[PDB]
């Protein structure tokens, strides 16, 4: 079901990223590696060849939107507000990170209010951890008492993608392919 994923009218916000179980389809990964409509196509712990040749119990396709200059954060061992607070790959990841520019789909004149990302967290995410919480974020020392006072904020932010933004600020659709053998990194058979 690579249609539901790559061609969806809409993608999830990065903080509330979507997960689709694939596992059981039939995937010519090599045709994806050739597109050149994909600005990005890094595989980890496996080459693009032999991407059909690895064994696993589960495969997942994760998908979301981030701005152009945040794509480099979707990779093992990265830092920043996306890898710390939104979508965290593990160091021993096996799978591929696909990305492409979606300015003509995800930007709106005036500003898109629909794509969100989390700005703050008390600690960094766990690999593949999903946080859809909206608790008030205490930035300073005085606790918030359930109210967004002086140092106390809703923890989410909007990208406001505009067609005219610079390319580092334009939206990119991202699909992470993940290969698991019993919660361990899949290898080649």
């Amino acid at each position, epitope marked *: 079901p690579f249609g539901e994923v790559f061609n969806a009218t809409r993608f999830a916000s990065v903080y509330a990223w979507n997960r689709k179980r694939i596992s059981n389809c039939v995937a010519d990964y090599s045709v994806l590696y050739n597109s050149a409509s994909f600005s990005t196509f890094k595989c980890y712990g496996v080459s693009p060849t032999k991407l059909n040749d690895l064994c696993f119990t589960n495969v997942y396709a994760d998908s979301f939107v981030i701005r152009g200059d945040e794509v480099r954060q979707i990779a093992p061992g990265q830092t920043g507000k996306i890898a710390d607070y939104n979508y965290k790959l593990p160091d021993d990841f096996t799978g591929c990170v696909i990305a492409w520019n979606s300015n003509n789909l995800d930007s709106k004149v005036g500003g898109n*209010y629909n794509y*969100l990302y989390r700005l703050f967290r008390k600690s960094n995410l766990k690999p593949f951890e999903r946080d859809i919480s*909206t608790e008030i974020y205490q930035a300073g020392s005085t606790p918030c008492n359930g109210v967004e006072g002086f140092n106390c904020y*809703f923890p*989410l932010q*909007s*990208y406001g993608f505009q067609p005219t933004n610079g390319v580092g600020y334009q939206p990119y659709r991202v699909v992470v392919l993940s290969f698991e053998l019993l919660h361990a990194p899949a290898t080649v058979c």
Partner: antibody
Amino acid sequence: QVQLVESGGGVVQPGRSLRLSCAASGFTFSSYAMHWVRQAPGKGLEWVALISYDGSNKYADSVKGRFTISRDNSKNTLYLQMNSLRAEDTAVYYCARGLGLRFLEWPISSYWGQGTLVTVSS
Amino acid sequence: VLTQPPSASGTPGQRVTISCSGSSSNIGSNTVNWYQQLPGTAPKLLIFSNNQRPSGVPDRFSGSKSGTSASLAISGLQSEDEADYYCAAWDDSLKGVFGGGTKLTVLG
């Protein structure tokens, strides 16, 4: 102690003008988009306008030529100038904060003001 | 610009749903939101981004969205739910729209 205290309501002769104020105090008002929403007694909420935390003003069609939204961030105050007022402009006017900082200007956040009643009549 | 049924009702403990119809300019392309309003009082946000809840909103409140429609589901209805519910959605015009509102009566 997040407060939104609005004032300026009362009775206005039709056709004349009126200015609403909304004074904020418990937070960094400079960082948030602000909205105005009206409600006539016994009827639905009608969105009026928003202003970004700096220069980006959107208006409802039903007021687009007559109302202007303003901020004075150094006084922590939101304004609403109303002109050519008409009997159907009679409502309770609420100010309200955007859901989040900066760009999360919409939707509205359930931090609202008290509401003030505008009456357009002779 | 957004149409809601004017009335809904249920018995304490039932599940009540409230519908919202829109257009391509709003619900069809932007997220939908829901507000609870008690009599003459400022509304409270209880759903954003189609189905996300602000902190404090019980999970028996639930939001969904498909195409140009949106629906609000109130499971385990309590008397303190008696109120006006408004769906809301940005319009690509750069407006911002509240539906007509649905007054919910708790009957038992």
